């Protein structure tokens, strides 16, 4: 029954806080910067290393202000939290591609209304 | 049924797997490929001479294709048509060469078809920095260049776009020709414009926008791939030196730990000596490896002069600076990484060949049937 396509999740996960690829990347980078210092400390694990190199290959933008601006311009809409991560991460070129990838957008908003947002996101990309 | 009651012998059928037999014209091509890839790094089949070896390889391939010959079948029954007992690994070597030549021909045909289709699509689209479908013929012709051919195809795809519906510095071909010749035939963009002017005609307001495109064009250029290829492959004086933890962990058990300061190991030590390659791979697996040619510092300097303008007077100085930046960017993209990957692949191949040769020698030594019969009959 758990299918993100139809916007259904467990109660505990419903109240979660979405994260973006750049957001998690900078969080992990700062954690690594803090941990590397303060000698006599248990070093990072392969999980941390793999997650770091996995998120580093999809950092659409390095500027925390870029992250802030995109989330601020996005939250003003009526879309659910789940729509804030996938759409902000994939950065599709056209509204048709976005609608095809995410079935939720089908009929939820106008074509130009979504296309302008997609163009804004692409532009915001560094 | 096919294995036992097949028209051709099972040995020939297995040997000519990628290539289901040889055609009369394809015999010449397969023989040429076998001659080319018989012994490039080490000396193998130099016994059979160059032309004599090529003719013998062609004769063996043709016999296998026509009479469905097998390795020993041609080695013995075709002693005249092949090296007359030149070496034990005659039929097997010929079969491997024929398989490789057939595979390369198939790859070249596929690439030529792809280039022709891409050129037709580009003509249909733009005919109703351009996209010219002229490199398809070059890629199809570049049969011997397998890795280089693949790099050229990938660069062409990434440059033309690869989409399938259903003036910044020197030209890429000119820069490649200059690098290959070692003399800068063509300079950078000798125009009064500078990066400040160039960064306004994309919408970024930054001066490296053309640097990115230049780096990509340099990287995905078959000429550059050919130029770099072999440059480090033929000679790489890998310095073996254990690291801080490798000195204790290896305990002189691997190539990177046996010599604390035994550096400057050329390609001869690793390719010719498969033990060195195996030790290097083992050391680099877990703890660390000391594999560095240390010869670029001076190979990367010479290219620096090429492809850049000579004057520096605003237009000239800016063109020179932009060319230098684009060359540095192309290097960081795919000049050191590409060379390192090629060297690593060559070292791995040399180690594998050394291991295979050692195994074959051991098998030959230990398989000779020498029983102790009454009176040593």
């Amino acid at each position: 029954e758990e299918d993100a396509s139809q916007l259904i999740f467990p109660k505990e996960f419903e109240t979660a806080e979405t994260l973006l690829n750049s957001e998690v990347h900078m969080l992990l980078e700062h954690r690594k910067q803090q941990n590397e210092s303060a000698e006599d400390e248990q070093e990072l694990s392969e999980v941390f290393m793999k997650t770091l190199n996995y998120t580093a290959r999809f950092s659409r933008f390095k500027n925390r202000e870029t992250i802030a601006s995109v989330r601020s311009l996005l939250l003003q809409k009526k879309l659910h939290k789940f729509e804030l991560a996938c759409l902000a991460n994939l950065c599709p070129e056209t509204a048709e591609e976005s609608k095809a990838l995410i079935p939720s957008l089908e009929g939820r908003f106008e074509d130009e209304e979504l296309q302008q947002i997609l163009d804004d996101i692409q532009t915001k990309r560094s | 049924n096919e294995i036992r009651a097949t028209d051709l012998p099972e040995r020939f059928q297995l040997r000519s797997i990628p290539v289901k037999g040889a055609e009369d014209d394809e015999l010449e091509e397969e023989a040429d490929w076998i001659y080319r890839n018989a012994f490039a790094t080490p000396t193998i089949s130099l016994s059979r001479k160059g032309p004599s070896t090529i003719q013998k390889i062609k004769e063996a391939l043709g016999f296998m294709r026509n009479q469905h010959f097998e390795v020993p079948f041609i080695a013995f029954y075709r002693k005249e048509y092949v090296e007359p007992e030149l070496h034990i690994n005659d039929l097997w070597r010929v079969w491997q060469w024929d398989e490789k030549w057939t595979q390369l021909r198939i790859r070249k045909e596929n690439l030529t078809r792809l280039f022709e289709k891409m050129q037709a699509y580009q003509y249909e689209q733009i005919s109703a920095i351009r996209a010219l479908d002229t490199t398809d013929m070059e890629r199809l012709k570049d049969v011997q260049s397998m890795d280089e051919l693949k790099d050229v195809y990938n660069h062409f795809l990434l440059y033309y776009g690869r989409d399938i519906p259903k003036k910044f510095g020197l030209t890429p071909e000119q820069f490649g020709e200059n690098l290959r010749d070692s003399y800068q035939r063509h300079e950078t963009e000798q125009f009064p414009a500078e990066p400040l002017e160039l960064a306004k005609d994309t919408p970024e307001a930054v001066l490296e926008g053309a640097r990115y495109m230049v780096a990509l064009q340099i990287a995905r250029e078959p000429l550059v791939r050919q130029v770099l290829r072999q440059t480090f492959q033929e000679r790489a004086k890998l310095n073996i030196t254990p690291t801080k933890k490798g000195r204790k962990d290896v305990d002189e058990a691997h190539y990177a730990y046996s010599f604390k300061y035994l550096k400057n190991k050329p390609v001869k030590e690793l390719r010719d000596d498969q033990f060195l390659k195996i030790c290097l791979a083992e050391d680099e697996g877990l703890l660390t490896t000391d594999i560095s040619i240390d010869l670029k510092g001076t190979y990367f300097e010479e290219i620096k002069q090429f492809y850049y303008r000579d004057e520096f007077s605003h237009q000239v100085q800016e063109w020179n600076r932009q060319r230098t930046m684009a060359i540095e960017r192309a290097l960081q993209q795919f000049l050191y990484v590409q060379m390192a990957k090629e060297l690593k692949n060559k070292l791995l191949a040399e180690a594998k060949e050394y291991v295979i040769k050692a195994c074959s020698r051991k098998l030959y030594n230990w398989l000779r049937v020498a029983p102790y019969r009454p009176d040593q009959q």
Partner: protein, 48 residues
């Protein structure tokens, strides 16, 4: 409980279950490889 700083499993943890002349069959639960279990020499161990 012992630590394996040297040997094939550099910087590895796990409880020991079986001993041998020059081998130790360590065991753990965090690991996933080989059903969460590994084996390494004895002299490359330290009493943690």
């Amino acid at each position: 409980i012992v630590k394996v700083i040297d040997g094939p499993h550099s910087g590895r943890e796990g409880e020991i279950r079986h001993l041998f002349r020059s081998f130790a069959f360590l065991h753990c639960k965090k690991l996933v490889e080989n059903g969460g279990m590994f084996v390494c020499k004895t002299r490359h161990l330290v009493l943690a």
